[PDB]
Design a protein around this ligand. Structure first.
Ligand SMILES: C[S@@+](CC[C@H](N)C(=O)[O-])C[C@H]1O[C@@H](n2cnc3c(N)ncnc32)[C@H](O)[C@@H]1O
Ligand SMILES: C[S@@+](CC[C@H](N)C(=O)[O-])C[C@H]1O[C@@H](n2cnc3c(N)ncnc32)[C@H](O)[C@@H]1O
Ligand SMILES: C[S@@+](CC[C@H](N)C(=O)[O-])C[C@H]1O[C@@H](n2cnc3c(N)ncnc32)[C@H](O)[C@@H]1O
Ligand SMILES: C[S@@+](CC[C@H](N)C(=O)[O-])C[C@H]1O[C@@H](n2cnc3c(N)ncnc32)[C@H](O)[C@@H]1O
Ligand SMILES: C[S@@+](CC[C@H](N)C(=O)[O-])C[C@H]1O[C@@H](n2cnc3c(N)ncnc32)[C@H](O)[C@@H]1O
Ligand SMILES: C[S@@+](CC[C@H](N)C(=O)[O-])C[C@H]1O[C@@H](n2cnc3c(N)ncnc32)[C@H](O)[C@@H]1O
Lengths: 291, 291, 291, 291, 291, 291
């Protein structure tokens, strides 16, 4: 019962995703295609990365992740197919997902296929990888690929061959590590006893504010739940709350909560109200946290 | 072939829904997950209720409805799982759905799982229930549930266990009726021989206007198809038309139709034009009908 | 493994599409329902037609295409169900889709079911058809159809019966060709050797600009992939570039590309940037191209 | 433009071949079907082998060879489909076919599909193969195959699916070499400094006599063009002549030529007269050559 | 991609068939001409019938069958063109042809054109017809037809006009049923519990013996696979075998097999040896079958 | 849509013709290859000539006629390629072929390519020619031709290049008329006013008898369609009948018809019965006709 989990920049307003799906069922008749999202900002490989890096622990072993924003579509660039190493625990704690004690996932159990444009930068950093190949064989891509639709030609199509059991190492030649394109991720800076980062995302549809300050950064300023914090956004908004597990800990509806989001990152919100929307807070604003 | 029908407030802009689906396929490998919608206004339990109350008659017997907006995520609250009694006829006329005379559905054939925050208020009113349980067993929820994602931890995951055949009565202790939270439904008032309600929803993407005035409220006033109505909105924007089965009965395109929608409620529209959008008509506006 | 590909104007904000899906699973339990889109402008049959005309070559043989915008819902009109002839090659070049040399599809392999309102106009022009029938049998539609929901009653429900093996010729009487409603496609006209048409679509989410000028319009205008073009939009905005296969051929991020999109038509974009959104370009604006 | 080249034992006296072709055009609408021959002695796998071993170098790359005599039709046996390795030079000299220096053919460019009964023995010996699969998938053969017509059910039909782009590896499980049936090729023996073979074929319609003594058997005896040979047949009818390139080198019409045929093998004829017919010479007769 | 499937009595030894083909390509440049056979006994309309009655299910809808033996060539007789009703299932079981569950063929989807000499007797009996016309219009036949070649003038030529889309009903006037010439087919006689018929054909090139006793005649003496039968040929040869699906069921090579042939008729053969040839068995000999 | 019409002495019993076809498709991928016949008596150039002389008026303009019996294969001889002048009317009367008044063909529209051995003798006599060239260029034949297969090397291969647009004048040097080998046609001679010729062919499969006496030989012998004739064959067998247009004019099945065949020549047959086969009549027997 193979699964392809599909994340693209193709949108939800025309038949582009359906074209790709049609081809997935043609190649792998017993497949289940799970939509991740198709709503990302086109060409923002850093946003795309965010929607896919946390996926593996939630899916059955053998799942293929077909992930693509493809601004170099039509050129002589070719996709990269990689078998990751660690499925990786996640969340505010760092645990397996599922009921009971969670579903432990074996190593070497998921494949990602993507343009070689840095989309997989965070996947490779947080999971590692065992093997990586250029996608070139005409067994798994078109001999005459549509120039403006490499997300279909070079990702959707070969993803389905992989789901159907095409050997990974036969899609094309092995890639050396330096041949895999990466974007740089800005580090969280130690700064006195303060940690200095950015708003990484506005968490839609709620308007929560997510930062790039990870639980591990907090876990060696020595900051746990209960700590009284000052989280300054945009240089000029010094929010103050204790770090709490969840929104309702702030008390009355509308009160500020500082918490660790489900991806493991320091976040700020209001309790059952929107923080970001009324005040137009945005990705890219500064975020400093301290006692 | 189990089905879970999934309605949430998680949105369509990141991987949130997909994480849920991954676990659903993990737990119940044979399952089909049907998206109801994920676009509801967060925390608006009355809106969520409208998207789920009409579902049972459409679905195969044995379908599990996983329905969630979870503003109390991370607190000691626990989800409720209920087996409904009557699948219930619906529509403007009150009938079974499907081809021929429709598909009559047996009693006791659908389970809802939701936060215990009133989301199921109208489901329980219109369908009844046979049994209800608190969802607490670590066989069906996580031992260490993610504080900010109870929509996954306490709804998606246990829904998949129920679809996989986990006995409903084993999810946790039985609930007494007074322990299941309800919201108050605004009452249609009689004011002279006029009926006074509210705009319950704008029917996107068309811009039709739905009220909370039911066909039963109309048949108790002796108002049937053919009747000349004055229907007044927001307390100034008035309208006049006979009650007709459908939009085309208003004649020329753009003309006003007053009709019964597919959920059984008095509604107003323009024939193949939008009523609500040009005039910025809105849910919450007063709606008064006089004959 | 029956598939129904489903394109509607029902939106993504309530349970409308899920009601249809529920019944599709009720009638055809082993079906896969693939969403095309549900976001088209309500009642815009020409837009709807664009989202379905290119589908067949991407899908497995036997796929049913359930395609609906139904402004005449609740009237005496009845749907049309047709088995197309040619699956038809497509793309900027004209090819079968898939890996290798692509996947050929046998003739007569796909059925469309649609309101008889012209929605299938371009499907029948591009693919031809082998048989057509009015959809009237109570074996495949309700005896008492819901007046405002013919997209469910007269499209979704009968599509599921067809997917399940119900004989196409038993749905109702055969329709003559003149009884199948058609829309008039706006023709690409002449002044000098400059082609004058329209913007047929903004290609979301990228903001690329699609015209109704086909590859064939360009050949024997003597415009080939080398040609330096002046393209005026809305009778005001002029652009200049050679015709190229893809976006990156423009050079730097932001540069103008005039190209043939993946559906076979002359289009214009910026390279990994949005052309339409910053200039507020729209469907239905005039488009003029000259060497 | 896919080609299937079709060799069978179905004859030319009824509609058998045509039924096969009808299905081939049905499945692969763009296909060209080329008849090799349908006149072979039924069930004679060694004869069929001779009509197909020399074909690849003549055909465009990507050609599918559908080759069948099927005495085990209706049993549990299943056809084999193999992609050959080397297209292989041929003729009296050993060269590529075609104008100029010939058309060199890339490796891995031809598929044979046949009963697994030894028919492909010489194809595999002379060309090698890259992969071989059992043909079992109901995507490419009938669910209820006609018991007496496996030449259509298990060869013609799947050949058309391969020409239409169905992935070879999806026809069924891979075969190990020992699972592909072979016949034993009769060995050319050395008897003194004479070579002892057999008449392998009468070359109709001319009545030339072909032996199984190869040019490589001759060059290993230091026998080249110009050599005076005694070639003895059926163990009594002897002949004497030099080895020459062609028939006209025997001088007057009716004179004996000893030559290398276009398949690379020692042969004997009369110059523009028949050798075999007047004397009723036959395949299976002994053939001994002394220099 | 129109197809003409061509069956004649013109032979394979001169340019007669090529003349007709040349004219087919002249009239319908995109046509594919599929040879059925050209080897029938001249003027034996009953043999001709046998080569064409089984064709439709194997070919794409819209195929034109050009079928002719024309002993009345040069007279004032004119051909008949008919659109058949049922494509009809066939074979030992009675099923659609092709991979999977077969290709279902729509009604009214094939045209036959023939001399009105009884050639179409079995086509009309087993398929039925919707409309029939005399072929007279000089749009589709020569004004001055070659007297000795009506197979070209009155069949080949108009067949190509029909393939190219000439309206069937415009070739000439409608024919009443009684105006269509039929030969009589001898019935299978019930006779005790024995069924009494004839050898209808020797199945070349194998020498299998085909009778006119159909699966339906067996299917109400109550005779299925496994029944121990006595099949007496020529009054004096009481063969005995169980009815089996195929030849190899008889066991050792040479053993007698009684089976249902691919056309649906009771047949007798030897397993991978010829029955008819060594003993000179012939069409027209008696055939009786019983328990 | 290039066509090659292919007449050889290669037979229908091995892969010889398919080797030629493979290369024709290799060189001219969009070609249609039409078989004329491959069954002529090997090396009988006069028989070969009969099968090709009447072809041009039946085929689309631009058709290449590849026509070969090559007993001088492997010698220094080279083929001749000629563009004929007149397409030429034919038949018992002398007309253009096709529906209506027939299809006129422009002058200079067809090329024949043949061994320079007299095979084209009657083609050049009946049609004339505009240009002729020796076929020597390595652009169109092999540099190292297979000695025993010049029908492939020097006819099939160059025919495909000509079909593809290769300029006829670039195949080799122009040939003067005297360098084109001719055979001597046996002349219809005189004793009294009785015409004395030969049986030119047995018209298989019917067993009709063709003489070398043309319609023109008969006119100004004063023999018209009323004339009562005595025709003696082989100097022994006498027959009597009037000259009629067709076989059925003889009356009862079996009666004698003397007529003009579809190629323009005096012939004799039985009405829907074989004249030649029962009496063992053959090509080359004497034929004598008198009023
Ligand atoms: C935040 S979401 C999980 C999806 C989120 N995008 C993530 O990745 O973690 C889970 C539940 O949290 C509740 N929630 C989200 N933001 C909230 C807030 N600010 N206050 C109260 N509850 C909130 C929502 O009702 C939703 O059902
Ligand atoms: C009303 S929608 C059904 C979904 C709707 N949200 C409901 O729950 O009843 C079904 C068909 O109604 C047609 N429709 C909706 N609003 C209309 C209007 N104002 N005029 C004409 N047709 C309308 C649409 O084209 C749609 O395909
Ligand atoms: C154009 S989309 C195909 C869907 C599109 N609606 C169509 O029908 O062709 C495929 C890839 O093209 C890339 N793309 C789209 N527009 C682009 C542009 N203007 N510049 C560079 N890349 C673009 C996107 O990143 C996407 O993954
Ligand atoms: C009998 S044929 C099908 C054509 C036949 N004329 C018909 O219409 O059914 C299919 C395969 O059957 C095999 N076959 C035919 N006669 C056979 C026999 N007597 N024993 C074993 N196999 C036989 C042949 O090898 C041929 O490839
Ligand atoms: C030998 S055939 C090629 C086909 C043959 N079956 C083969 O596979 O090599 C090619 C030309 O050879 C010529 N040929 C064949 N046998 C000949 C013979 N014994 N003497 C002279 N010419 C011959 C024929 O006229 C024919 O056109
Ligand atoms: C004579 S054939 C044309 C081919 C022939 N080889 C020629 O070149 O004219 C056309 C039709 O004539 C009919 N025919 C041929 N010989 C006949 C005969 N002796 N009596 C009656 N009909 C005949 C056949 O049934 C055939 O369909």
């Amino acid at each position: 019962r193979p699964i392809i989990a599909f994340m693209s920049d193709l949108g939800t307003t025309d038949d582009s995703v359906a074209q790709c799906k049609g081809l997935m069922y043609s190649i792998c008749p017993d497949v289940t295609v799970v939509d991740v999202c198709h709503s990302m900002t086109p060409w923002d490989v850093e946003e795309g990365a965010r929607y896919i890096v946390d996926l593996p622990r939630f899916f059955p072993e053998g799942t293929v992740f077909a992930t693509t924003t493809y601004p170099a579509t039509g050129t002589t660039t070719r996709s990269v197919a990689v078998r990751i190493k660690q499925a990786a625990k996640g969340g505010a704690r760092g645990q397996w997902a599922g009921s009971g004690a969670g579903f432990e996932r074996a190593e070497g159990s998921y494949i990602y296929i993507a343009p070689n444009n840095g989309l997989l930068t965070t996947v490779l950093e947080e999971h590692g990888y065992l093997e990586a190949y250029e996608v070139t064989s005409p067994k798994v891509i078109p001999e005459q690929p549509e120039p403006t639709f490499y997300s279909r030609e070079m990702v959707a199509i070969p993803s389905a061959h992989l789901a159907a059991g095409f050997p990974l190492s036969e899609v094309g030649r092995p890639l050396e590590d330096h041949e895999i394109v990466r974007f740089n991720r800005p580090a969280v800076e130690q700064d006195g006893e303060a940690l200095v980062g950015v708003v990484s995302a506005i968490d839609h549809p709620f308007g929560n504010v997510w930062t790039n300050i990870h639980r591990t950064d907090l876990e060696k300023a020595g900051i746990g739940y209960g700590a009284r914090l000052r989280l300054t956004l945009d240089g000029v908004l010094p929010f103050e709350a204790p770090l709490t597990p969840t929104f309702a800990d702030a008390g009355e509806i509308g009160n500020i909560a500082i918490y660790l989001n489900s991806r493991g990152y320091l976040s700020i919100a209001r309790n059952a109200a929107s923080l970001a929307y009324p005040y137009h807070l945005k990705e890219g604003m500064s975020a400093r946290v301290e006692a």
